[PDB]
Ligand binder design. Structure first.
Ligand code: AMP
Ligand code: AMP
Length: 324
């Protein structure tokens, strides 16, 4: 495995810090049926978890957003290992309201945010359950109830205090994992709108910089990305299949095609994971760029996971500069 290159975009000098966003691929969906091209011994969680940890540890981000973190893995692996490195963390599973055995409850995945206690102090934590937000806002709309409310997805957010010696300063970090099905671009879009307006809100109760990490399951051309990038989208955008605006001014850390793919499978490759930040308060100094395509080609790797790549997503990592 060759080092992915750093791509520097702006020079320093304010407070700099790094953010990692990584979908880890939970054990429950790591099957031969979905990943036929990868040996069982390399799919097995005992094997893959080492690679996942190594990835996270060596990125050594100040802020880590993870998706597809298994509940029991959060308590017995991610959190104790990352505490050992100076982090604290917040986790919520999906399906909290769903009835299931204790066994099944250990295996349910969710979203985690972690942060260096040396650099940040946790002030507030929130969980946003898209099913419940959909139901409370259905309004005699049949699509909402049948299509959105039936999707079990979530987002989490923390309010953090940025330690003044890095320059009472606040930062909101939000992590989400939208529904995956490309037949459901409307759900993806609506889940994004609910997430953004639920975040605008957290922002009221406690003008405050925002970092948004997500597995959006949406291409850069999509209505969801259009909506996050341009502050709004038209109510008749084709992605709704069946103008809406937001208050933030956000940019993608990796915009203008810096990676060709974040998710990498035999059947599908493209950019679907993102780190967005509020441009009024921050710049990107740099990003961790793509794994070298020659290396993948030379090693005959057209899908992940693989023995040297422990997930079917690649991590994103960005350095940002924050101003008061
Ligand atoms: N301890 C439990 N609490 C709640 N539901 C349970 C429990 N045990 C079994 N169930 C129900 O039985 C289904 C299958 O259980 P299991 O065979 O243990 O996976 C679960 O999805 C639940 O609907
Ligand atoms: N925008 C999209 N277009 C086509 N397929 C997608 C898209 N987003 C997700 N997928 C599919 O869903 C998978 C991502 O699942 P997840 O692990 O939830 O991100 C991809 O590997 C594709 O199979």
């Amino acid at each position: 495995l060759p080092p992915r290159p750093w791509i520097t975009l702006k020079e320093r000098d304010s407070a700099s810090f790094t953010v990692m966003c990584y979908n880890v691929l939970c054990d429950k969906y790591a099957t031969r049926q979905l990943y036929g091209y990868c040996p069982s011994w390399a799919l097995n969680w005992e094997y893959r978890k080492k690679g996942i940890m190594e990835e996270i540890v060596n990125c050594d981000a100040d802020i880590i957003s993870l998706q597809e973190v298994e509940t029991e893995q959060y308590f017995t692996l991610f959190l104790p290992a990352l505490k050992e490195r100076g982090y604290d963390g917040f986790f919520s599973p999906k399906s909290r309201a769903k009835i299931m055995s204790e066994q099944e409850r250990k295996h349910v995945d969710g979203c985690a945010i972690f942060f260096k206690t040396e650099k940040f102090t946790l002030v507030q934590k929130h969980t946003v359950e898209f099913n419940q937000v959909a139901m409370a806002n259905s309004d005699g709309s049949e699509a909402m109830l049948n299509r959105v409310m039936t999707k079990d997805n979530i987002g989490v957010a923390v309010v953090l205090e940025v330690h003044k010696e890095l320059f009472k300063q606040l930062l909101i970090v939000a992590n989400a994992h939208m529904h995956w099905d490309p037949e459901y671009s409307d759900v993806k879009l609506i889940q994004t709108m609910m997430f953004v307006s639920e975040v605008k809100n957290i922002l009221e109760k406690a003008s405050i910089p925002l970092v948004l990490c997500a597995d959006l399951n949406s291409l850069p051309d999509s209505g969801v990305v259009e909506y996050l990038s341009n502050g709004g989208v038209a109510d008749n955008h084709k992605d709704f299949k069946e103008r809406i605006t937001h208050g933030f001014q956000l940019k993608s850390a990796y915009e203008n095609n810096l990676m060709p793919y974040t998710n990498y499978t035999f059947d599908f490759k493209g950019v679907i994971d993102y780190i967005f930040y509020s441009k009024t308060h921050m710049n990107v100094l740099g990003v961790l760029g793509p794994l070298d395509p020659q290396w993948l080609v030379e090693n005959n790797i057209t899908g992940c996971p693989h023995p040297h790549i422990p997930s079917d997503h690649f991590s994103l990592l960005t350095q940002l500069e924050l101003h008061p």
